[PDB]
Amino acid sequence: DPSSINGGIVVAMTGKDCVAIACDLRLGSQSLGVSNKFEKIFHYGHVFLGITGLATDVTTLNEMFRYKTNLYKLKEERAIEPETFTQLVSSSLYERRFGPYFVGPVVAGINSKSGKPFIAGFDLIGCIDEAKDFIVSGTASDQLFGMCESLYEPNLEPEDLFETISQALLNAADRDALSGWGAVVYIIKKDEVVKRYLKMRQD
Amino acid sequence: YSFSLTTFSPSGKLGQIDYALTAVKQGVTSLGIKATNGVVIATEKKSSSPLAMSETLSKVSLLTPDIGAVYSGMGPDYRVLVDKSRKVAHTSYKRIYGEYPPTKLLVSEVAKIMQEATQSGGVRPFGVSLLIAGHDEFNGFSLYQVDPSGSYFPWKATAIGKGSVAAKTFLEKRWNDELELEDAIHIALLTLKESVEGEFNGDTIELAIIGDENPDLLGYTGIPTDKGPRFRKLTSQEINDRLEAL
Amino acid sequence: TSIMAVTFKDGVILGADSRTTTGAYIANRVTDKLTRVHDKIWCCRSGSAADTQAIADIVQYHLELYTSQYGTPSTETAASVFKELCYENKDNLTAGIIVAGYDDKNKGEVYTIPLGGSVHKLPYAIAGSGSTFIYGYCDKNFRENMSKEETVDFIKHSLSQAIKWDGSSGGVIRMVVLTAAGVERLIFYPDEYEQL
Amino acid sequence: TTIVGVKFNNGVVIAADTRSTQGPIVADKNCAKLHRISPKIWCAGAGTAADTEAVTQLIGSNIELHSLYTSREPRVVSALQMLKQHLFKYQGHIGAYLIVAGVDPTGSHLFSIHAHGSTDVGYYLSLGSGSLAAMAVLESHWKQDLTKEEAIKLASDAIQAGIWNDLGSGSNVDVCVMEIGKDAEYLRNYLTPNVREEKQKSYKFPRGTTAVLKESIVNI
Amino acid sequence: MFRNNYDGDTVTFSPTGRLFQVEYALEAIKQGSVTVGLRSNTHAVLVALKRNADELSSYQKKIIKCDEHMGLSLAGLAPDARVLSNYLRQQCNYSSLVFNRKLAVERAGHLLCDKAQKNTQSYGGRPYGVGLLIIGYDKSGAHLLEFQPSGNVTELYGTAIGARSQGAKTYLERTLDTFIKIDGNPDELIKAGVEAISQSLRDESLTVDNLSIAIVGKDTPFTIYDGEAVAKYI
Amino acid sequence: YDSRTTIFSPEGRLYQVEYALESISHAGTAIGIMASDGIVLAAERKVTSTLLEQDTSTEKLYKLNDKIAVAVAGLTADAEILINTARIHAQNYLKTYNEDIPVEILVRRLSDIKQGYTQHGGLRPFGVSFIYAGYDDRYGYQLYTSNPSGNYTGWKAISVGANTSAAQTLLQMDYKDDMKVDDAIELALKTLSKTTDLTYDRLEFATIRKGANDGEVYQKIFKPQEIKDILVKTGIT
Amino acid sequence: MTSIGTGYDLSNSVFSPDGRNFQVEYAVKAVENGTTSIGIKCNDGVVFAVEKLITSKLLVPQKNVKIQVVDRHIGCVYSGLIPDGRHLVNRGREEAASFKKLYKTPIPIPAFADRLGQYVQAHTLYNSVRPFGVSTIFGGVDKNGAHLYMLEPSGSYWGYKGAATGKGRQSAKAELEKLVDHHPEGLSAREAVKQAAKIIYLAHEDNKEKDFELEISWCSLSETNGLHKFVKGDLLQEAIDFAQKE
Amino acid sequence: QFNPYGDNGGTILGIAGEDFAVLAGDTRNITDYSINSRYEPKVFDCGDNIVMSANGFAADGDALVKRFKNSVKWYHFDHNDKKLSINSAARNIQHLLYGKRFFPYYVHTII
Amino acid sequence: YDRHITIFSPEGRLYQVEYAFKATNQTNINSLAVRGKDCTVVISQKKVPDKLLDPTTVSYIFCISRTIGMVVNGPIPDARNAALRAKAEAAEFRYKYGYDMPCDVLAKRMANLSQIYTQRAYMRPLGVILTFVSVDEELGPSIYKTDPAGYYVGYKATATGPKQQEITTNLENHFKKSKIDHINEESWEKVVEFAITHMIDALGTEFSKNDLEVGVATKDKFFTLSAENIEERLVAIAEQD
Ligand SMILES: [Mg+2]
Ligand SMILES: [Mg+2]
Ligand SMILES: [Mg+2]
Ligand SMILES: [Mg+2]
Ligand SMILES: [Mg+2]
Ligand SMILES: [Mg+2]
């Protein structure tokens, strides 16, 4: 199936006045690993989007959303919020109901007005996972579910959230042949965003 | 008729738009007043027969839960714009974002609709001007006029139609940037009272406000994050109440 | 499903079981398969429930339009409209429909429209999965010009037997009576028809 | 999924479980399956989750326009015709399966609707993977002329049957009560009989547990 | 002077209910040269006078076969004649392929009528400005039809259209009792026709260059005589 | 016959285009001035009442993207149509090439749309003239105009709308081939002051300049009070 | 009347200041130049008759048939621009076939009347066509008996006891009226045939200069089993002899 | 599953002489093991001294001969009864056949 | 242009629409509609002078749906164009939305179609005034009237025709006196009688059974009266012994 040709994973988690989102770096073609630097996480203003699945669609969706959000900012005269972007992603996906993009997007961000952390996931045709502890996606989503349900607890400080989402991603990835090969982690607060590249197994 | 019927004349003016405005200037007065905690829009309900029931018609229309409109000029042009405006709010905004459009963008869509009638082949421009009152989370309360040309301007207060010159004048004197909705309602009434020839009660006046959220108009409980609509039209009773203790 | 319609001396009676299944699950045990498309023109439904509801709906619309423009449509005309929809869309419908009506000239009429969209006028018609089991019974017990009571009995006996043998049939027996006096709905419960 | 509908003497009640599943995995353990078509018309869905949500929104939008246009309260039968005609047009490919309930100027209504466009009507209904367990309860405990409190209890018992017996279902009960003459009453997590027990330990890592190659500030 | 206000398009009645654009179309026929049609019970015949531009040019065809049992002659707009006769060819052909049936001449006339009519009731085009004489031989015998720009088609024993055609038309009325009885004698029916068209000559004579003749009938497929083929009749 | 928009006059003139230009010469004046390190856009507002909500609008200047803005003269509603196609064109280019659109390329496309209306289709032309201010890494700071003829030209300084010839004269007078963006502002305000038929409530103002913090390009749509404070410091108070 | 509506009579679908459409009234003037045609409703049927002007002896007798059949049960005859008449009948044939295809029963006469009417009035809606230059008399037998109608260039139609149009219509109408007065109990189809021949004969005195040929058709329950048939042979001659005696 | 093609048997035979040609066919028409007709001609005079047989699926064969005869009719209309030469008939028949290259007449043509 | 197509005159008027209104009086007949407690009655003059006409085919009243009746003031072919359109709209509405089209909703719909002909050059307005009646399931007895300007409104009662101001003032006076907005009779017959009596009064003429036509809406259906029932009504109000 198309959603397991290139491989890769995304996970997002909420913490106290923070959210985090993470992904691996792999792009392969079946068993052949090809790119060691294929990030799966993008941002439009202060809203983050991670995307797993077919790499060509990952790239396409990014461009589509940069396009849509840029127009939004121009017309609305303010940058899009995570809640609103979430609906936009959903309807964009559903528009292709019968010829869908083979993706599993994930949204993370902090609403500029409430200061409230927000995450969501989607199936390939736009169904929204409204859950607000963690969201997982990709070829190691089973592993991720297991890691998150285990390691997660609510209202982690950013420094602690960083360890949690890191260990969830790293350990899930090492049990998946199609994921891994590097990772990036974003810790997102109101006034600061920190990106980090994790050290992991290279097999 | 596959050619524009609005064209430029040697003075550079566009006749059909001007004549559209003339129709507007001929219409019954209507007005809008923006307060610090709300906006009011108002018009007179001239019944073209006493056997007619004016309640069955509505010159003030809800567009979204937070946005309403009133008009001067040709009523049927207005009615049709109202239908189009409600639909475009769903088709170009709510179905994409799951949110109602903010006022200025909805005003902008209606402006497009009107601009198009002044350029497309085989059609006359709309013969109305709208006043549109709204609220949205990031801009607060606003008030716009759209003209037959598709031009729109934001107002603190204004009047349109027949008695608009005197009404704009009255409004210039009484308006300040600290009116509360109740002041704005009161002033709107006093203003409409000049324009009104004939009867003047809660039955010949239409009046709506964009103000606080009304949870009691939601129709359901249980989603606490769910905001009531800010738009409310005043009853005949409510309008008479204010009129006696004017 | 077990559906039939029977002309008699004063008009026509439609009958049906009330069972709708998906697999071996009875999704509806009290289905109403007797569907009205005009005052004294009704139909019995078998086959895909989506298809037969969708067909009857559009036929009701056509006959409403017919009425405001041309006057009262005939039973035949209603059968014509059903047929046209069933025949033209044969490759995408599973609908076995009996059309039954009353009027002052013909009294009762019955048109069965099998899969494929052909149409057949008949003094009575049986249809649906359960009808196979009652071919011989109905042939031996139907008379032309029965009374209302004799006709109710015939259908009760007929559908009771079809329900007995057919897993796709069951529930209550529904009947609609079309005559000059108007439209009458009847119902019979298992404890009545299972003893016949 | 387990959804049910139950009519009572003065309205209708709708209820659902709260588990959504990617295969044998639970994606959302506290999902919301009770959707609003209009203030007093609510629906619960099973089948393809995106189709169920999308079609809900489409009709809700149109019902709203219809209502504004006609200056009338939306009618349940209108949602019914619009939905079934849309689903039929798509020949089953929109995998929506819904129980739609409501009150309007003509009274109180309860319908089911399937992906191919067929509809049923009754006093009590169930859909989704847990519908056989729920229907077993309904068939055991329904009676005509339920009070509101009895129809809530019955519908809530039916969802429970699916929560406990259907692997496709689980977690919490949500109900909406639509009574004639009143505001619809949406009860989110009316029941929460499945709280995780406290874990045996905290898995918070000591800070610095995770190896980093490089670090940098991103500018929004 | 008043007519000038109501004659701009075929979609405008004059205050007395005239369509001047259709009336003007009739005048286009008078700019053509004369052609005659006539018939008995066994044969139908056309005679045409062909024009040249000068002594260096050919003479323009006036007669067009539409099928084995049907053809026509024209006076007026040549392009119009090309359009309408191709249309007839198609209708005859359609009748043959689908029904294995020769198109009746009466039915050919009706189809022609309906097509021309449409041009007279809608904005955008113009009436056909050509006249057609149609001969044929079908199951009900020999036929002659006259087509007008208005679409109106009339069944006649004989007629003439085009410039100076009144003379021939008078001669055909005058000789009616005689020519309709010329049965089993095609050359004699042709002679009557040549004689008729001769009444429409003004200081000009029928030659192997300008004279065109057509005939159809019982056991006689639609045939067109030009050049030396017409000499025996001159 | 001059009602018909895509037919030549007997002098090979296009009347509707010419009349559209007449209409524009009666619109609120807009200036654009290019400095060595920035561009200035200024528009005097046609409409004035005291009850007009001057803040929260800006209806003569528009961002087309992060790097390009326009100033409008003519039917504001006509403008909005073309402004919206432009924003879309700029986004398509970004989507296709993953680069920002070169200013001239965006300009040429809108000019082509305008041109189209002059050659086919029977619809009236748009009654707008645009001054485009933009930056790209190929040509740096740029200034263009376009009018209903569908013509476009590049400028070091320019005006459109009412009193254009009066404005052009002043700009021809006090323009140095390499000024500084703060002077071009002053010049702009002076020139609008010398042709006004002048307060902050009647002005819209924007700049595009090197952010100085650092190496990047910035678009500022001046707020009303900002316009006030810049109106005094240049002695128009 | 102002017969000429100067400035409002130059294109179809334009309302004159008194609410007339002059093009339609002009189309009527062409109908008044046509040959006379009539219809007589009888006891179980309808009869049609038309005057056919023998413009030249070159016309072949009994050819150039004017009365047309629609479906199997409807006759049509018209006066004015004959090709407009065929055009309308072509439309009627499609409408009839289309009705018969969906609904199986032959199109009822009032239903057929309204199909023709809407089509005819559709041609008074736009300047891109002209009105029909015919008045059409038509009808037949259905489940409700005999029906006879006349349809004008405006699209206007009504049912009739007897109908006349064309040049000699005033004369014909007068005889139709005497006929009505004289037969309160009804008129047999055979009788109506003869009486129809007489009437066309009397009307012909308006075109007395030219010869004419008589064409008659009917549709009757007892005579043609409710199918449209041309009156021929002895019955025809019997009516011709009768008409002449008067 | 609708099969649009059939096989009607029959055999045909063309031989050219110095100043003549011959086209022969049997008159039998078949369906599987049955005889539809013992005399159903399949060699046709198409005019202009052109004879033709399209053998195989008789429905396609008939259709092809029909289309060709029509092609002659129009050739004559277009060119004042000019004889269609045999080489010209052949090239034309090429086009009729290749026109249906993706849904072919299931026949063997000889002229 | 502005005297011929629906574009603005310098006074911001639409002449073809104004002229379209003039067309509505061309049939020279008046209608009135009145509401009862539980019915709506529509009445219109019927003038059939030509004795060759079948009077039973002459009607300006139409059964739009099972519940909606319509009476038209204006020429019959524009009248029948509208009648056909409304019938189709009402059928489509029931099919799409699953309930009977309300009278005011049908009126609005037709009003909108009408406003479109005032905005698009190529279509002319219909020269008609459409009075719609029903006993609506939510609103009760209802009268909604539409004009060639695309305007409509609901009415306590209304009248249309050359002598409409006469009939109108006759009704206003009655409704002033009465202090309610409908006729307090349950019997549709009494409501019909009322309407005939007040029309006779306002027009200064008597009527025979052939001089008018009558439609009646109830909760169940809209129906028209035979000349026989009309006569029966005329007798009910006969003041001579
Ligand atoms: Mg996965
Ligand atoms: Mg791995
Ligand atoms: Mg490896
Ligand atoms: Mg059973
Ligand atoms: Mg050759
Ligand atoms: Mg118009």
PDB file of C-alpha atoms in Angstrom, chain C residues 5-153:
ATOM      1  CA  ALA C   5     -51.670  -7.552  -4.290  1.00  0.00           C
ATOM      2  CA  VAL C   6     -55.099  -8.993  -5.083  1.00  0.00           C
ATOM      3  CA  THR C   7     -57.923  -7.470  -7.119  1.00  0.00           C
ATOM      4  CA  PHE C   8     -61.381  -8.197  -5.812  1.00  0.00           C
ATOM      5  CA  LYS C   9     -64.981  -7.221  -6.341  1.00  0.00           C
ATOM      6  CA  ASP C  10     -64.715  -3.750  -4.748  1.00  0.00           C
ATOM      7  CA  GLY C  11     -61.095  -2.779  -5.491  1.00  0.00           C
ATOM      8  CA  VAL C  12     -57.662  -4.070  -4.543  1.00  0.00           C
ATOM      9  CA  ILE C  13     -55.783  -5.224  -1.425  1.00  0.00           C
ATOM     10  CA  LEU C  14     -52.005  -5.011  -0.936  1.00  0.00           C
ATOM     11  CA  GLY C  15     -50.269  -7.277   1.556  1.00  0.00           C
ATOM     12  CA  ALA C  16     -46.728  -7.673   2.867  1.00  0.00           C
ATOM     13  CA  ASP C  17     -44.583  -9.186   5.616  1.00  0.00           C
ATOM     14  CA  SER C  18     -42.602  -6.736   7.766  1.00  0.00           C
ATOM     15  CA  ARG C  19     -39.121  -8.308   7.849  1.00  0.00           C
ATOM     16  CA  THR C  20     -35.978  -6.612   6.453  1.00  0.00           C
ATOM     17  CA  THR C  21     -32.747  -8.559   6.818  1.00  0.00           C
ATOM     18  CA  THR C  22     -29.066  -7.957   6.284  1.00  0.00           C
ATOM     19  CA  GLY C  23     -27.383 -11.332   6.390  1.00  0.00           C
ATOM     20  CA  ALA C  24     -29.228 -13.384   8.992  1.00  0.00           C
ATOM     21  CA  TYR C  25     -29.759 -10.279  11.115  1.00  0.00           C
ATOM     22  CA  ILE C  26     -33.291  -8.878  11.062  1.00  0.00           C
ATOM     23  CA  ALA C  27     -32.421  -5.195  10.746  1.00  0.00           C
ATOM     24  CA  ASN C  28     -36.121  -4.247  10.883  1.00  0.00           C
ATOM     25  CA  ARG C  29     -38.887  -6.509  12.167  1.00  0.00           C
ATOM     26  CA  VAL C  30     -41.712  -4.055  11.529  1.00  0.00           C
ATOM     27  CA  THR C  31     -40.867  -2.685   8.061  1.00  0.00           C
ATOM     28  CA  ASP C  32     -43.688  -1.076   6.098  1.00  0.00           C
ATOM     29  CA  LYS C  33     -43.327  -2.337   2.548  1.00  0.00           C
ATOM     30  CA  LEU C  34     -46.670  -0.908   1.483  1.00  0.00           C
ATOM     31  CA  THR C  35     -45.846   2.424  -0.068  1.00  0.00           C
ATOM     32  CA  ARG C  36     -48.149   5.167  -1.245  1.00  0.00           C
ATOM     33  CA  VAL C  37     -47.401   7.054  -4.463  1.00  0.00           C
ATOM     34  CA  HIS C  38     -50.866   8.604  -4.945  1.00  0.00           C
ATOM     35  CA  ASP C  39     -54.220   8.600  -3.093  1.00  0.00           C
ATOM     36  CA  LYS C  40     -55.517   5.277  -4.341  1.00  0.00           C
ATOM     37  CA  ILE C  41     -52.336   4.116  -6.064  1.00  0.00           C
ATOM     38  CA  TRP C  42     -49.893   2.201  -3.871  1.00  0.00           C
ATOM     39  CA  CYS C  43     -47.082  -0.273  -4.293  1.00  0.00           C
ATOM     40  CA  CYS C  44     -45.452  -3.297  -2.622  1.00  0.00           C
ATOM     41  CA  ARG C  45     -41.668  -3.323  -2.331  1.00  0.00           C
ATOM     42  CA  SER C  46     -39.110  -6.132  -2.642  1.00  0.00           C
ATOM     43  CA  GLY C  47     -35.409  -6.110  -3.395  1.00  0.00           C
ATOM     44  CA  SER C  48     -32.856  -3.488  -2.340  1.00  0.00           C
ATOM     45  CA  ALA C  49     -34.522  -1.217   0.200  1.00  0.00           C
ATOM     46  CA  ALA C  50     -32.454   1.740  -0.962  1.00  0.00           C
ATOM     47  CA  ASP C  51     -33.502   1.078  -4.545  1.00  0.00           C
ATOM     48  CA  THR C  52     -37.221   0.577  -3.874  1.00  0.00           C
ATOM     49  CA  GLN C  53     -37.458   3.592  -1.541  1.00  0.00           C
ATOM     50  CA  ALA C  54     -35.574   5.735  -4.072  1.00  0.00           C
ATOM     51  CA  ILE C  55     -37.859   4.545  -6.891  1.00  0.00           C
ATOM     52  CA  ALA C  56     -41.122   5.004  -5.050  1.00  0.00           C
ATOM     53  CA  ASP C  57     -39.977   8.517  -3.951  1.00  0.00           C
ATOM     54  CA  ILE C  58     -39.308   9.658  -7.483  1.00  0.00           C
ATOM     55  CA  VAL C  59     -42.556   8.044  -8.725  1.00  0.00           C
ATOM     56  CA  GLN C  60     -44.496   9.906  -6.018  1.00  0.00           C
ATOM     57  CA  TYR C  61     -42.872  13.127  -7.242  1.00  0.00           C
ATOM     58  CA  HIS C  62     -43.822  12.392 -10.895  1.00  0.00           C
ATOM     59  CA  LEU C  63     -47.435  11.654 -10.006  1.00  0.00           C
ATOM     60  CA  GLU C  64     -47.676  14.805  -7.836  1.00  0.00           C
ATOM     61  CA  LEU C  65     -46.480  16.797 -10.825  1.00  0.00           C
ATOM     62  CA  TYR C  66     -48.840  14.857 -13.068  1.00  0.00           C
ATOM     63  CA  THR C  67     -51.787  15.687 -10.803  1.00  0.00           C
ATOM     64  CA  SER C  68     -51.244  19.480 -10.676  1.00  0.00           C
ATOM     65  CA  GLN C  69     -50.836  19.632 -14.473  1.00  0.00           C
ATOM     66  CA  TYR C  70     -53.038  16.967 -16.012  1.00  0.00           C
ATOM     67  CA  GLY C  71     -55.433  15.707 -13.356  1.00  0.00           C
ATOM     68  CA  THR C  72     -55.764  12.315 -11.679  1.00  0.00           C
ATOM     69  CA  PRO C  73     -53.281   9.757 -13.070  1.00  0.00           C
ATOM     70  CA  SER C  74     -54.475   6.240 -13.826  1.00  0.00           C
ATOM     71  CA  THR C  75     -53.126   3.094 -12.150  1.00  0.00           C
ATOM     72  CA  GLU C  76     -51.700   2.139 -15.558  1.00  0.00           C
ATOM     73  CA  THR C  77     -49.883   5.489 -15.795  1.00  0.00           C
ATOM     74  CA  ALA C  78     -48.274   4.885 -12.368  1.00  0.00           C
ATOM     75  CA  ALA C  79     -47.181   1.435 -13.529  1.00  0.00           C
ATOM     76  CA  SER C  80     -45.781   3.127 -16.654  1.00  0.00           C
ATOM     77  CA  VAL C  81     -43.712   5.551 -14.579  1.00  0.00           C
ATOM     78  CA  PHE C  82     -42.309   2.756 -12.341  1.00  0.00           C
ATOM     79  CA  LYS C  83     -41.540   0.644 -15.421  1.00  0.00           C
ATOM     80  CA  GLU C  84     -39.656   3.424 -17.171  1.00  0.00           C
ATOM     81  CA  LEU C  85     -37.430   3.913 -14.103  1.00  0.00           C
ATOM     82  CA  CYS C  86     -36.917   0.174 -13.522  1.00  0.00           C
ATOM     83  CA  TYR C  87     -36.250  -0.718 -17.168  1.00  0.00           C
ATOM     84  CA  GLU C  88     -33.950   2.224 -18.014  1.00  0.00           C
ATOM     85  CA  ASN C  89     -31.849   1.706 -14.866  1.00  0.00           C
ATOM     86  CA  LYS C  90     -32.035  -2.100 -14.923  1.00  0.00           C
ATOM     87  CA  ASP C  91     -28.244  -2.394 -14.668  1.00  0.00           C
ATOM     88  CA  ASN C  92     -28.242  -0.608 -11.297  1.00  0.00           C
ATOM     89  CA  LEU C  93     -31.400  -1.597  -9.476  1.00  0.00           C
ATOM     90  CA  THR C  94     -32.657  -4.569  -7.570  1.00  0.00           C
ATOM     91  CA  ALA C  95     -36.368  -3.815  -7.347  1.00  0.00           C
ATOM     92  CA  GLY C  96     -39.351  -6.176  -7.556  1.00  0.00           C
ATOM     93  CA  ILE C  97     -42.395  -3.949  -7.382  1.00  0.00           C
ATOM     94  CA  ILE C  98     -46.138  -4.544  -7.440  1.00  0.00           C
ATOM     95  CA  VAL C  99     -48.266  -1.513  -8.365  1.00  0.00           C
ATOM     96  CA  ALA C 100     -51.918  -1.641  -7.270  1.00  0.00           C
ATOM     97  CA  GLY C 101     -54.722   0.906  -7.624  1.00  0.00           C
ATOM     98  CA  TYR C 102     -58.417   1.689  -7.457  1.00  0.00           C
ATOM     99  CA  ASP C 103     -60.560   3.801  -9.779  1.00  0.00           C
ATOM    100  CA  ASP C 104     -64.300   3.976 -10.483  1.00  0.00           C
ATOM    101  CA  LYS C 105     -64.134   2.432 -13.958  1.00  0.00           C
ATOM    102  CA  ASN C 106     -61.733  -0.507 -13.568  1.00  0.00           C
ATOM    103  CA  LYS C 107     -62.155  -0.906  -9.841  1.00  0.00           C
ATOM    104  CA  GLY C 108     -58.961  -2.684  -8.736  1.00  0.00           C
ATOM    105  CA  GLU C 109     -55.827  -3.098 -10.847  1.00  0.00           C
ATOM    106  CA  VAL C 110     -52.503  -4.863 -10.322  1.00  0.00           C
ATOM    107  CA  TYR C 111     -49.270  -4.489 -12.278  1.00  0.00           C
ATOM    108  CA  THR C 112     -46.195  -6.495 -11.309  1.00  0.00           C
ATOM    109  CA  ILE C 113     -42.810  -5.201 -12.440  1.00  0.00           C
ATOM    110  CA  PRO C 114     -40.125  -7.895 -12.019  1.00  0.00           C
ATOM    111  CA  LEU C 115     -36.346  -7.415 -12.102  1.00  0.00           C
ATOM    112  CA  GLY C 116     -35.496  -5.994 -15.529  1.00  0.00           C
ATOM    113  CA  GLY C 117     -38.436  -3.683 -15.782  1.00  0.00           C
ATOM    114  CA  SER C 118     -41.003  -5.567 -17.849  1.00  0.00           C
ATOM    115  CA  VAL C 119     -44.599  -4.938 -16.800  1.00  0.00           C
ATOM    116  CA  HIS C 120     -47.525  -7.319 -16.474  1.00  0.00           C
ATOM    117  CA  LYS C 121     -51.132  -6.544 -15.669  1.00  0.00           C
ATOM    118  CA  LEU C 122     -52.661  -9.368 -13.568  1.00  0.00           C
ATOM    119  CA  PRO C 123     -55.793 -10.162 -11.452  1.00  0.00           C
ATOM    120  CA  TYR C 124     -53.330 -10.805  -8.643  1.00  0.00           C
ATOM    121  CA  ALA C 125     -49.552 -10.848  -8.136  1.00  0.00           C
ATOM    122  CA  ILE C 126     -47.105 -12.354  -5.640  1.00  0.00           C
ATOM    123  CA  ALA C 127     -43.416 -11.398  -5.295  1.00  0.00           C
ATOM    124  CA  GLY C 128     -40.320 -11.365  -3.108  1.00  0.00           C
ATOM    125  CA  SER C 129     -38.176 -14.234  -1.840  1.00  0.00           C
ATOM    126  CA  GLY C 130     -41.107 -15.781  -0.016  1.00  0.00           C
ATOM    127  CA  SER C 131     -43.500 -15.948  -2.948  1.00  0.00           C
ATOM    128  CA  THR C 132     -41.799 -19.011  -4.481  1.00  0.00           C
ATOM    129  CA  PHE C 133     -43.269 -21.144  -1.687  1.00  0.00           C
ATOM    130  CA  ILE C 134     -46.843 -19.997  -2.317  1.00  0.00           C
ATOM    131  CA  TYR C 135     -47.154 -20.265  -6.111  1.00  0.00           C
ATOM    132  CA  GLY C 136     -49.122 -23.510  -5.846  1.00  0.00           C
ATOM    133  CA  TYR C 137     -51.181 -22.301  -2.870  1.00  0.00           C
ATOM    134  CA  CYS C 138     -52.226 -19.017  -4.465  1.00  0.00           C
ATOM    135  CA  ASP C 139     -53.029 -20.634  -7.802  1.00  0.00           C
ATOM    136  CA  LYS C 140     -55.456 -23.050  -6.112  1.00  0.00           C
ATOM    137  CA  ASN C 141     -57.118 -20.517  -3.846  1.00  0.00           C
ATOM    138  CA  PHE C 142     -57.518 -17.340  -5.894  1.00  0.00           C
ATOM    139  CA  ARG C 143     -60.927 -16.544  -7.440  1.00  0.00           C
ATOM    140  CA  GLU C 144     -61.893 -13.444  -9.353  1.00  0.00           C
ATOM    141  CA  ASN C 145     -64.402 -11.122  -7.666  1.00  0.00           C
ATOM    142  CA  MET C 146     -63.974 -12.206  -4.077  1.00  0.00           C
ATOM    143  CA  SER C 147     -65.478 -10.105  -1.289  1.00  0.00           C
ATOM    144  CA  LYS C 148     -63.317  -7.937   0.925  1.00  0.00           C
ATOM    145  CA  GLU C 149     -63.405 -10.502   3.726  1.00  0.00           C
ATOM    146  CA  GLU C 150     -62.657 -13.449   1.428  1.00  0.00           C
ATOM    147  CA  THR C 151     -59.753 -11.460   0.002  1.00  0.00           C
ATOM    148  CA  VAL C 152     -58.260 -10.521   3.361  1.00  0.00           C
ATOM    149  CA  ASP C 153     -58.413 -14.224   4.232  1.00  0.00           C
TER     150      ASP C 153
END
